[PDB]
Curated annotation (Swiss-Prot), chain B:
Summary of the tissues where the protein is detected: Widely expressed.
Protein name, entry field: COP9 signalosome complex subunit 1
Subcellular localization, as worded in the UniProt entry: Cytoplasm; Nucleus
GO (cellular component) term, any one: nucleus
Domain PCI: 214-376
Source species taxonomy: Eukaryota, Metazoa, Chordata, Craniata, Vertebrata
Species whose genome carries this gene: Homo sapiens
SMART domains for this protein: PINT (SM00088)
Binding partners and assembly: Component of the CSN complex, composed of COPS1/GPS1, COPS2, COPS3, COPS4, COPS5, COPS6, COPS7 (COPS7A or COPS7B), COPS8 and COPS9 isoform 1. In the complex, it probably interacts directly with COPS2, COPS3, COPS4 and COPS5. Interacts directly with inositol kinase ITPK1. Interacts with CAPN8. Interacts with USP48. Interacts with ASB4; this interaction negatively regulates GPS1.
Keyword entries, A-Z: Cytoplasm, Nucleus, Phosphoprotein, Signalosome
GO molecular function: GTPase inhibitor activity
GO BP term, example: regulation of protein neddylation
Pfam families: CSN1_C, PCI, RPN7
Domain topic, free-text comment: The PCI domain is necessary and sufficient for the interactions with other CSN subunits of the complex. Mediates the interaction with CAPN8.
UniProtKB/Swiss-Prot annotation, chain C:
Name recorded for this polypeptide: Kelch repeat and BTB domain-containing protein 2
Involved pathway(s): Protein modification; protein ubiquitination
Listed GO biological process terms: gene expression; glucose metabolic process; lipid metabolic process; phosphatidylinositol 3-kinase/protein kinase B signal transduction; proteasome-mediated ubiquitin-dependent protein catabolic process; protein K48-linked ubiquitination; regulation of cellular response to insulin stimulus; response to insulin
The species this protein was found in: Homo sapiens
Upper classification of the organism: Eukaryota, Metazoa, Chordata, Craniata, Vertebrata
Residues of the BTB domain: 26-93
Entry keyword set: Kelch repeat, Phosphoprotein, Repeat, Ubl conjugation pathway
Residue ranges occupied by any BACK domain in the UniProt entry: 128-224
Length: 564, 412, 557
């Protein structure tokens, strides 16, 4: 266990009193002309450098004035007070110098805290800076976790200025890695070319190594004469060298070109009765069913969103409290497309049940979702910031709605309910009244294809389809999906292969559920049979399962072993 | 299911006979299942739950008592928990527990197995008093490691048995009963306590034949055993299970030979008469006492679901034995051998014949139950002819299989 | 201000504790008769109000790595230093005096309060005068006054302790001149002063001129001068003159201890104000007055009473209904209740019996769940602790227990067992021919008088004869349920019974019973103008109290 806490607090606050009131100070730190009167005890408890500074036997053992150099006054003051009061106020700016002084003074505890701060602060705009920082100081855990987030993010942006100022060893590890996420192998080629041409002949010796990590499908085509233009004059040790050099190193395709348009399913019927629900996916091209990681702490009643950058997020949901037992939590998670795991993120402010997650302008919008408040503003609409990793409230929606769906069209949020629709204008944070539907239908989903909204189904569900045009602002009927009579189809609207397809599972009387998808002809207003899902690969999923459009890697994921 | 209305329970004796968390569980279920008496049952429960610093179940019981008092304020047209207890109870409970924890952790730095085991048992006892089941188990599951002597193993088994009853982990009870019995070479009657725990656990696990056998071996010298089950209910538990499973000669031997169940039957004269009437073929008085025993003991903890099955078995067994020494048994007289009607007995008899073990035919004309004594030879010949026909059919099937396999006949 | 301590404040205490035991970064070391105590200035500053000035004043002490602190014990400083490093005092019962002494040297105000509370709680029987001089040497006013009242009672009880001889003059004057002497006679204080004065020589004769005038003049004209004639130094003339001057003056007044009237302590009476449930009152057999007492917990009820031969009142157990194993003791002068060591089991209506200076609690619903339901537990009035004893033979409810001839006797429905304190065993006794419960027994002389039960059953038992016999029936009005109470009054067996009828008021009357007459003669009838209704669950016990300290209970006749 521990020891007496009531005296632990008394001594702690009294040492703080003896620090603010400078009485029992035998050693003072001289940093850039700033006096830091303190004790040898407190500096010893935190830092592992002062233990080699005082109890070492050097000249400073008896000297009462030490001139600590290559440090910062603010960083020293916060470190000293942290050793004195433990309140480590970590902002978003001074953490860089905080780690520098923590490593210099070898203070293990603050090193772990700032590493825990940086493991949460890793994002898009500082991935390169943190990796270089993680390369400068040995922080392998941060270095590896950065590298993974770095690997995906460089491929996406590949335009940050700190990428040019990187060590040769770091670049070789980044480029030769098999975790890059690229639609083509040519974007990494030009990224290396611009990095090599960024500086003078100091990149010439590294050019013999950077090309040794890139595949040979581009080491004989264009971007070889371009280097000859940029070659130092009369250098005959490079042009001939690269002429006969690209024989070895085993051309092999990378892993980033292995993303296929797949239908991600959540809360599917668990195969083993020991678990409540599971998550699976259907492959429209591979015609197989790949398993997915379980929702975080079997998070049920959640919502899914896929950003244009192909990122999966989970918000809302409830966990069974420790027979009916369920408690709602506002936890937020992010799915790793390669590690097959859900990385936790900043939680929301209010708990939600079945929230509608919609992405727009890089912000994740969660509209409604049976909030816990229940006050006059029983909607609690709030967006998420993907660069600052925080949540910001938005303009409340006019009318309280339940069991609603939302889509994004023309950089605007379009949320749909039983019969009403309101469009949110993110630039002014306002809501405008939209067209009114003539049919009262709920418990349905909508897919945003182009500049039109397709509300498919509604109430089991039915085959009613009401097409809404943003430019026309009107709801019109197109047709009804031809399905077997005396059945209860489960419609799922989704956009795939630049076309509006439907994932409709139908069940007949005294018969098992049948899976089949149809391709809706936009100009002909007819659902055509695109593909029939055989039951030998896909089993029953349930009723409360959700579907979304996204891309996943079949290599990182594993096939689900289950009998037809 | 249960939660029926019926008067005349003596709350004072049933509460005082037991003691501990077992008593707390008994007072709660009695209040929850016996209306028109829940208030005093809850009032006595909360008055005892506040003792020994309970935390979570107190809130549940106080809320139930508050609801019960509110109900009493509207029928003949809620007590305060005194939350100063919360401040008082928590502050005392923490300080003594932290003091005890400090001692044990220091003893863990002293490395003495028995002291670690004894301290962990003390921590488990405190956690059970605090209302922390799993917390006590881990303390008890760390005392199991540091055992030194046979008595230490016996104490370890008893503690796990006690906790797993509250946890309803009866598998852990039975495993530790077997460990405590079979290991140490099968005045201090220690095996009697183990047998009592096993019988109660088996009965709660929907077992009657072995539970009665274990309960019959329980000696009355155990006397005070309130942490698991009072002797009054033990006698009732043994008697009902014995009546349902043990046959006549099986009943007579076991009750008499044990000589401790005779003392148990002295404690509960009602079941003693029931068994005696069962022996003397007076099932009319036997079952009318049984129905009187039904209401008084259907608000019991581990009995209420099982007693209905036990009583149903008793009714079936009584009918089977009654008709056994009868050739032309008048259904009127058999109906007169109970408070049942002629039609109800006929339906009960018909059900018994359909299930079996009565071997009878009902003559509804004169309402006389005639026993069936079929000739062995006729049935033997009939089933032998049926067997021969089935053998010929299977031989034809096998010959056809051989024909289709030899000629290589199969769907491509 | 934010002073959060979750999983950090403990860490700093540990980190400093690891460095202290590993001897890291010590800048000051204490030399204690050659023993080295490497420690730190910061921790010494917070713990001690002297060590802060030991390292701050501009003297040569500040620039000195080795400081030779003397007049301090190594063990006491070490336990103070470790208390400054972990906070757990873990004080024993023997080294309390020296630990307080060193906390008076280096001003450890924190441990000083802890030791003061420990000392103020453990003034049991013998160290009272010893620590009173200790409280005289070191100013501990709160403990000084608490010991003063305690000494005033206990010293008068023993008045032979050797530690009392070595006392300062001022403390003796305060003790002896106070009007809190618990003495029934004025001669015992006279001889106590005489033996104190004859213990030494001329130096104490100087104090004799000031202490001889602090007692009442009735004892200054006595043999004191005659015994002082042989004990006076030769050639002393003026001392005799000043001795003769102490006869007439200085306000001869009566003391307080002589008001030790035998009275009756009652508990759970009919409260006057409806806001209160029960109350504790008293009755004066001689003064014919009804006094009141303060409820010990003021909310808990169902307590048991016991009176030691030294006239002490104790309260144990009870329910408040949750059962609490708390213990209390009644102050004979402050009219309050000082708690004591609680019991290990929460008893309901315990039966406390005093024998050989030990309090024996027999039965009373200990916890109920014990494997052997037939158990008892005793108390130690000297060591202040509870010691387990041999368990009870048979399970009894609503039982009574008394003490006769320094032996424990417990009575139930029909059975009786005698507990032999020397061997700690129970022995079977005579069986009663009548089964009666809900009754109590009285230990008068060498005979036990079991009165009542369900009535008016008078069943007398003799220890020397070991037999039960009938005497007579108490004269009571028919169609009534008497509530019998048997207790020893004025060295005479008497009873206190109340009769209640239908549509009639309760009447209180006590009768005088004779051993050879077998008749309850009318001794005194308690008038309703002074005493009101008591109730049904009230208890009665015999004890001596002080009228001045207590207050009369107001009630309209």
């Amino acid at each position: 266990r521990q020891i007496n806490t009531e005296y632990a607090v008394s001594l702690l606050e009294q040492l703080k009193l003896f620090y603010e009131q400078q009485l029992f100070t035998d050693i003072v730190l001289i940093v850039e002309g700033t006096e830091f009167p303190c004790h040898k005890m407190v500096l010893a408890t935190c830092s592992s450098y002062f233990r080699a500074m005082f109890m070492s036997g050097l000249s400073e053992s008896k000297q009462t004035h030490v001139h600590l150099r290559n440090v910062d006054a603010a960083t020293l003051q916060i470190i000293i007070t942290y050793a004195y009061t433990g309140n480590l106020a970590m902002n978003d700016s001074t953490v860089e110098q905080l780690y520098e002084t923590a490593c210099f003074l070898q203070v293990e505890d603050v090193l772990q805290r700032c590493r825990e701060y940086l493991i949460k602060k890793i994002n898009a705009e500082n991935c390169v800076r943190l990796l270089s920082f993680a390369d400068l100081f040995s922080c392998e855990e941060l270095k590896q976790s950065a590298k993974r987030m770095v690997e995906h993010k460089f491929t996406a942006v590949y335009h940050q200025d700190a990428f040019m100022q990187l060590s040769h060893d770091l670049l070789i590890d980044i480029l030769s890695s098999d975790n890059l996420n690229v639609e083509k192998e040519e974007t990494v080629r030009e990224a290396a070319m611009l990095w090599l041409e960024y500086n003078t002949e100091s990149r010439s010796q590294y050019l013999s190594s950077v090309l040794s990590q890139i595949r040979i499908d581009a080491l004989s085509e264009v971007t070889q004469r371009a280097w000859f233009q940029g070659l130092p004059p009369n250098d005959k040790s490079v042009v001939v060298q690269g002429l006969y050099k690209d024989m070895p190193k085993f051309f092999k395709p990378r892993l980033g070109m292995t993303k296929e348009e797949m239908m991600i399913f959540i809360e599917a019927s668990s195969e083993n009765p020991c678990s409540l629900y599971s998550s699976v996916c259907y492959s429209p091209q591979a015609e197989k069913v790949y398993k997915l990681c379980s929702p975080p702490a079997d998070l049920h009643k959640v919502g899914t969103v896929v950003t244009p950058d192909n990122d999966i997020y989970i918000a809302g949901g409830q966990v069974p409290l420790k027979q009916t037992a369920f408690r709602t939590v506002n936890c937020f998670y992010w799915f790793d497309a390669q590690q097959n795991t859900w990385f936790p993120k900043t939680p929301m402010l209010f708990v939600r049940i079945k929230p509608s997650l919609v992405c727009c302008e890089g912000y994740i919008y969660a509209i409604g979702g049976d909030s816990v408040g229940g006050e006059l503003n029983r909607r609690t609409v709030e967006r998420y910031d993907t660069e600052k990793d925080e949540w910001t409230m938005v303009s409340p929606l006019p009318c309280a709605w339940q069991w609603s769906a939302a889509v994004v069209v023309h950089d605007c949020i379009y949320v749909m309910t039983l019969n009403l629709m309101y469009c949110y204008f993110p630039r002014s944070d306002s809501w405008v009244e939209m067209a009114m539907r003539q049919t009262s239908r709920s418990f349905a989903s909508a897919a945003a294809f182009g500049d039109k909204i397709f509300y498919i189904g509604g109430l089991g569900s039915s085959v009613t389809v009401e097409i809404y045009d943003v430019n026309k602002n009107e709801w019109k009927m197109a047709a009804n999906i031809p399905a077997k009579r005396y059945s209860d189809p489960c419609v799922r609207a989704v956009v795939i292969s630049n076309s509006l397809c439907v994932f409709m599972r139908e069940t007949h009387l005294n018969e098992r559920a049948k899976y089949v998808t149809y391709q809706y002809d936009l100009e002909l207003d007819r659902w055509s049979l695109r593909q029939h899902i055989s039951e030998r690969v896909l089993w029953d999923l349930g009723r409360d399962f959700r579907c979304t459009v996204g891309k996943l890697y079949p290599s990182c994921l594993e096939e689900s072993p289950w009998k037809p | 299911n249960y939660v029926v209305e019926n008067p005349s329970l003596d709350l004072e004796q049933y509460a005082a006979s037991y003691s501990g968390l077992m008593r707390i569980e008994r007072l709660q279920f009695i209040a929850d299942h016996c209306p028109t008496l829940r208030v005093e049952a809850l009032k006595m429960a909360l008055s005892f739950v506040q003792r020994t610093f309970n935390v979570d179940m107190y809130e549940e019981i106080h809320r139930k008592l508050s609801e019960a008092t509110r109900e009493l304020q509207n029928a003949p047209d809620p007590p305060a928990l005194d939350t100063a207890w919360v401040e008082a109870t928590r502050k005392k409970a923490l300080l003594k527990l932290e003091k005890l924890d400090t001692d044990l952790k220091n003893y863990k730095g002293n490395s003495i197995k028995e002291s670690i085991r004894r301290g962990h048992d003390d921590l488990g006892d405190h956690y059970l008093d605090c209302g922390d089941l799993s917390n006590a188990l881990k303390c008890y599951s760390r005392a199991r490691d540091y055992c030194t002597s046979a008595k230490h193993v016996i104490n370890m088994c008893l503690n796990v048995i006690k906790v797993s009853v509250y946890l309803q982990n009866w598998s852990h009870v039975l495993s530790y009963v077997s460990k405590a019995e079979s290991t140490p070479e099968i005045t201090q009657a220690i095996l009697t306590k183990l047998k009592c725990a096993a019988g109660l656990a088996e009965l709660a696990a929907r077992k009657y034949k072995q539970a009665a056998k274990c309960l019959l071996l329980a000696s009355f010298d155990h006397c005070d055993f309130p942490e698991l089950l009072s002797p009054s209910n033990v006698a009732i538990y043994g008697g009902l299970c014995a009546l349902a499973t043990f046959d006549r000669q099986e009943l007579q031997r076991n009750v008499i030979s044990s000589s401790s169940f005779k003392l148990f039957l002295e404690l509960e004269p009602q079941v003693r008469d029931i068994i005696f009437k069962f022996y003397e073929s007076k099932y009319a008085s036997c079952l009318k006492m049984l129905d009187e025993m039904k209401d008084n003991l259907l608000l019991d903890m581990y009995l209420a679901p099982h007693v209905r099955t036990l009583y149903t078995q008793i009714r079936n067994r009584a009918l089977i034995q009654y008709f056994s020494p009868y050739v032309s048994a008048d259904m009127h007289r058999m109906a007169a051998a109970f408070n049942t009607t002629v039609a109800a007995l006929e339906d009960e008899l018909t059900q018994l014949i359909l299930e079996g073990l009565i071997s009878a035919r009902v003559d509804s004309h004169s309402k006389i139950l005639y026993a069936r004594d079929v000739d062995q030879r006729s049935t033997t010949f009939e089933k032998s002819l049926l067997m021969g026909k089935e053998f010929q059919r299977r031989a034809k099937a096998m010959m056809l299989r051989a024909a289709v396999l030899r000629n290589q006949i199969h769907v491509k």
